[PDB]
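Handout, section 4.2: multi-component inputs.
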Amino acid sequence: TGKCGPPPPIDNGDITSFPLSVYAPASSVEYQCANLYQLEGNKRITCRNGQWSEPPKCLHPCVISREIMENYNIALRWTAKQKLYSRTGESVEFVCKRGYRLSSRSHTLRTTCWDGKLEYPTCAK
Amino acid sequence: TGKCGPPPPIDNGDITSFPLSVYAPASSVEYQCANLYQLEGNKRITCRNGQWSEPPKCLHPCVISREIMENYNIALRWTAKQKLYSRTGESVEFVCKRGYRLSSRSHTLRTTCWDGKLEYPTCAK
Amino acid sequence: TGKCGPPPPIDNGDITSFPLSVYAPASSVEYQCANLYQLEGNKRITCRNGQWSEPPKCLHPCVISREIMENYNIALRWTAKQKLYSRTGESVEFVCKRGYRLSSRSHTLRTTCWDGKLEYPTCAK
Amino acid sequence: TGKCGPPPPIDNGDITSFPLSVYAPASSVEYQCANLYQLEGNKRITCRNGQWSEPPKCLHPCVISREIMENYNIALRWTAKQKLYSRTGESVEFVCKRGYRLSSRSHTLRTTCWDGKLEYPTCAK
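Output:
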């Protein structure tokens, strides 16, 4: 008859309803990700044939690295608008520090967070 | 020119992006409510003329009361599906305990959570 | 015999264990407050004589107001260390904007967040 | 001089203060884990010589599996006290279903959650 047990926990996310001990086939619940995490895919899982469908993934935000920025000779462009943490899919804009210019082959000064990873621009004297 | 400061915190909710010190007019951010809380209204606030628009409200879940249920001679209908906490808008179904029947003027056995409040059915011997 | 039902939800906080439908006298659970909220009092509630003891309170963080700061002619002292949100009990330090000085009877430039409220210093030309 | 950047995010946890763009050596922040997650080790990280110390780990709760329980011929012992999710370090107690008894070499009926893993008892007809 295909009933399911309690829905699976996922990293950095939670279901939006109170977990029950058993669910009828065709039942569904939904996830939400922790605030700065981006929910990837379909938020809803459905019970069918004794198994829940695949939960979504909560994609990681990116944190600025002081060490990397110092090494690459860059700084945040907007000191009044500092995205110290950025959501996946969200862009962060840097500038070369005074006395430096973009190196060749460097990434653009504007760069996009993807699941924890920022590819930083590099500046050279 | 109408810039705004950091978005206002709301009870039982958070914005989905990292707060900035200043926002240009027309900028917007969005809220999400804590997992069992229901977001009422529009999740997005927009900055215009120096003020953020009105944030949404996170409506409270309902918790079952043992004392009230004992007093009213009721129990949860489905012992395998116990909604100890219910979301606003979600219904909970009771039954009269063995030897009792609904009193007249009683609420229906099925009853809906609204922002923390459940109106309980009452059974009589 | 004094058993208790599911522990009460509190604003901006959650219990650290999975809620059960019934608790024996002497049982206890504990709360934690949402990240920037300060837990006031004892985090643990205990079941006795059919009632849970009093839960703690989650004290609100304070958010900086651009409008108030502009009106009072002040700015954050440390632009590299901007406490846009401060925890209850945590202090925030302002400076008079260029061309202003503290007014008499003004609060000190350093001021402490208490449950959502900051008493701002005031500067005059 | 050894200043640090914004503290690192950790899975299933958050810092308790608002992130700053730079921290002086000797500064510290603290983490808390999401509600059913158990914080392993020291909650506080300290900035020294340009690096944060190692953050704690948030150990996973365990979810009961209907499929595994059905296969092993077991059920939760206390239907009024169902730990559908258990914290790391917390124990869950099963019983053999009617008509079964513990198999030899089986784990005890009482078993402890560790970071997502429950070792289930097994019953045989």
